[PDB]
C-alpha cells in the first residue's frame, strides 16, 4: 500500500530514515532487530528509490565503514538494486520513473568503491563472502598579518 | 573430395570425418547441398545424433527435397516398426527412447527444410508433410512413446515433434468444403473407421477421402495434445 508514495514523499522518507536509525540502536533484542531489518527491507523494496533518497544517502554515507548490524545495509542495497536495476544502471532509466539523480549516482558509486575496497582489504570470511560479495557483484553489475587583520575587520564590518 | 569419400564410406571413423565436415561447413551452393545430403544420409544410416548435426545452415531446397524425402520415409517406417514392436516392456521403452533421441536431429532438419521450402509446396513437400503427420499421429497414439521421448529430451538437456508437424499440417492442402474432413474428424472422435469419410464424400475420390481422413485425424490429435499447521508440526 505504501509502495510508490509521492504525496507524502518527505514524510515517508523521514520515517524510513528514522526506522533505519532505530535498527542500528544498541538497545534491542535479536528478534526485534530481525523484525526491524525485515520491515526496513520490505519498505525499501516497495518504496521507490527516489522517495528514499534521504534514507539512501544516510545508508551509503558509511556503509563500508559500519560493521555492526552489517546485514541490513547489504540487504537494503541488494533489494534496491534488484528492484530498480535499470533506474540507475541504464542511462534512460525506468519506462515510468526514468533516470536517477547525478548526486545519487555519484554517492552510490562512492559507496560501491568503498565497499569493494574494504572487501579486497578485509580477510576472507564465510559470512563476508555470503553477504558483502553478492552486494559487490550487484553493484558492479549496476555499472554500465596586519593586512590580514585589517581584512578580517573589514569582513566583520561587511 | 572428402565429403564424397565420407558419403561413400557410410562407423568407427565417423567421429573423425565429422570434425572435418563441421570445419568445412563453418568456413562456407551445390557442393554445400551435396555435403549436407551426404551428412544426412550418414546420420540416417547410423551423443551421436547431436554430433551429427551440431548446427543447421542449409540453403538449397533442391537437395533437401531430393534426399530428405527418402530419409522421411525411412524415419516413418522406423517409427511404425517401433510402434508395432511396442504393441506386441523395459526393452521396448528403451528402444523407443533411443529412437526418439536420434529423431531430434532429423526432426530439426525436417523443420528447417519445411521453413525454407514453405514458399513452394511441391508434391514432394506434400508427401513429406503427410509422412510427418502420420509419424506424429503414431507417436501420439501410444503414451509410452511420448514418455520415452520426454525422458530422452530430459536426458539430452513429443511436444516438440507435434509443434514441428503442426506447420506441415497447416501447409497441407484440403478440400474447400471440408465436409468429408469434418465427418472424418467426428468419426475419429468416436474412434470409427474411414468408411464414414468415404460415405460422406460420396454423399480419385478414394484418394481425396483418404487425405481428408488423415487430415482430420491429425487435427484431432493436435487438438487433444493442446487440450493445516497441525499436520506439518506432526510431520516435523
Amino acid at each position: 500500500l505504501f509502495a510508490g508514495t509521492e504525496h507524502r514523499a518527505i514524510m515517508v522518507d523521514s520515517m524510513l530514515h528514522t526506522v533505519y536509525r532505530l535498527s542500528r540502536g544498541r538497545s534491542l533484542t535479536k528478534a526485534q532487530r530481525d523484525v526491524i531489518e525485515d520491515c526496513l527491507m520490505a519498505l525499501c523494496r516497495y518504496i521507490r528509490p527516489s522517495m528514499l533518497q534521504h534514507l539512501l544517502r544516510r545508508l551509503v554515507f558509511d556503509v563500508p565503514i559500519l560493521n555492526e548490524f552489517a546485514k541490513m545495509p547489504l540487504k537494503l542495497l541488494t533489494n534496491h538494486y534488484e528492484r530498480c536495476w535499470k533506474y540507475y544502471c541504464l542511462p534512460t532509466g525506468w519506462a515510468n520513473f526514468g533516470v536517477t539523480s547525478e548526486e545519487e549516482l555519484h554517492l552510490t558509486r562512492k559507496l560501491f568503491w568503498g565497499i569493494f575496497d574494504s572487501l579486497a582489504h578485509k580477510k576472507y570470511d564465510q559470512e563476508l563472502y555470503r553477504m558483502a560479495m553478492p552486494c559487490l557483484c550487484a553493484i558492479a553489475g549496476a555499472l554500465p598579518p596586519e593586512k590580514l587583520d585589517s581584512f578580517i575587520n573589514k569582513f566583520a564590518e561587511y | 573430395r572428402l565429403m564424397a569419400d565420407i558419403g561413400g564410406l557410410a562407423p568407427h571413423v565417423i567421429e573423425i570425418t565429422l570434425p572435418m565436415l563441421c570445419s568445412y561447413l563453418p568456413r562456407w551452393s551445390d557442393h554445400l547441398n551435396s555435403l549436407l545430403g551426404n551428412i544426412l544420409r550418414i546420420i540416417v544410416n547410423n551423443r551421436l545424433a547431436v554430433f551429427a548435426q551440431p548446427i543447421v545452415s542449409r540453403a538449397r531446397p533442391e537437395l533437401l527435397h531430393s534426399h530428405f524425402i527418402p530419409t522421411i520415409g525411412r524415419l516413418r517406417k522406423r517409427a511404425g516398426k517401433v510402434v508395432a514392436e511396442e504393441e506386441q516392456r523395459d526393452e521396448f521403452s528403451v528402444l523407443c527412447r533411443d529412437l526418439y533421441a536420434l529423431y531430434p536431429l532429423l526432426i530439426r532438419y525436417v523443420d528447417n527444410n519445411r521453413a525454407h521450402w514453405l514458399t513452394e509446396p511441391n508434391a514432394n513437400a506434400e508427401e513429406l508433410f503427410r509422412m510427418v503427420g502420420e509419424i506424429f499421429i503414431y507417436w501420439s497414439k501410444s503414451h509410452n512413446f511420448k514418455r520415452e521421448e520426454q525422458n530422452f529430451v530430459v536426458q539430452n538437456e513429443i511436444v516438440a515433434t507435434l509443434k514441428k508437424m503442426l506447420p506441415i499440417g497447416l501447409n497441407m492442402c484440403a478440400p474447400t468444403d471440408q465436409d468429408l474432413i469434418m465427418l472424418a474428424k467426428t468419426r475419429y472422435a468416436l474412434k470409427d473407421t474411414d468408411e464414414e469419410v468415404r460415405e460422406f464424400l460420396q454423399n480419385d475420390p478414394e484418394k481425396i477421402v483418404r487425405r481428408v481422413q488423415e487430415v482430420s485425424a491429425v487435427l484431432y490429435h493436435l487438438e487433444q495434445t493442446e487440450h493445516s499447521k497441525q499436520r506439518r508440526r506432526a510431520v516435523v
Binding site: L28, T29 | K229, R231, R232, A234, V235, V236
Partner: protein
C-alpha cells in the same frame, strides 16, 4: 511444556538454581539467576536476560527459572525439527527427493495423511528439493 529439557538437563538446572538460591526459600535474584546460567554455560546477554525475565521482590523462583528456560528449550526443539525437515531429503544423499520418494516419505510419516492430503501438500510446495521440503514443512 516445562519438561522439554532432558532429565539430566533438568537436574543440572535445579542444581544451579539451588546454588544460586542458597537461602533455601526458592526465590533467586535476577543477578544470581544470570550468574547461575553463566556458570551452567547458558550465558545470555543483558537484553536477552531482560526479555527472559519479562517473559517469565526482584527475585525469580526455581520453577520460574525453569519456565523461562523452557522457552529456550522449545526454540532449540523447533530449530532441531527444522534441521530434520531440511535433512530428510538429504538423508538419501541425493538432496532432491522425487515425487515417488516424497510420497513414500509422506506414507511413512503416518500423520493421518491420505492421497488427497499428500497431493495438496505437494501442490502447495517433479523432484522436491530439500530446501523446498523444509519450506513446505515450515508453512
Amino acid at each position: 511444556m516445562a519438561d522439554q529439557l532432558t532429565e539430566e538437563q533438568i537436574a543440572e538446572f535445579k542444581e544451579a538454581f539451588s546454588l544460586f538460591d542458597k537461602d533455601g526459600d526458592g526465590t533467586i535474584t535476577t543477578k544470581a539467576l544470570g550468574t547461575v546460567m553463566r556458570s551452567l554455560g547458558q550465558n545470555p546477554t543483558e537484553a536477552e536476560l531482560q526479555d527472559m525475565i519479562n517473559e517469565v521482590n526482584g527475585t525469580i523462583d526455581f520453577p520460574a527459572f525453569l519456565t523461562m528456560m523452557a522457552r529456550k528449550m522449545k526454540d532449540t526443539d523447533s530449530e532441531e525439527e527444522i534441521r530434520e525437515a531440511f535433512r530428510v531429503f538429504d538423508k538419501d544423499g541425493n538432496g532432491y527427493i522425487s515425487a515417488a520418494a516424497l510420497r513414500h516419505v509422506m506414507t511413512n510419516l503416518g500423520e493421518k495423511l491420505t492421497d488427497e492430503e499428500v497431493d495438496e501438500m505437494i501442490r502447495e510446495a517433479g523432484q522436491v528439493n530439500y530446501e523446498a521440503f523444509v519450506q513446505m514443512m515450515t508453512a
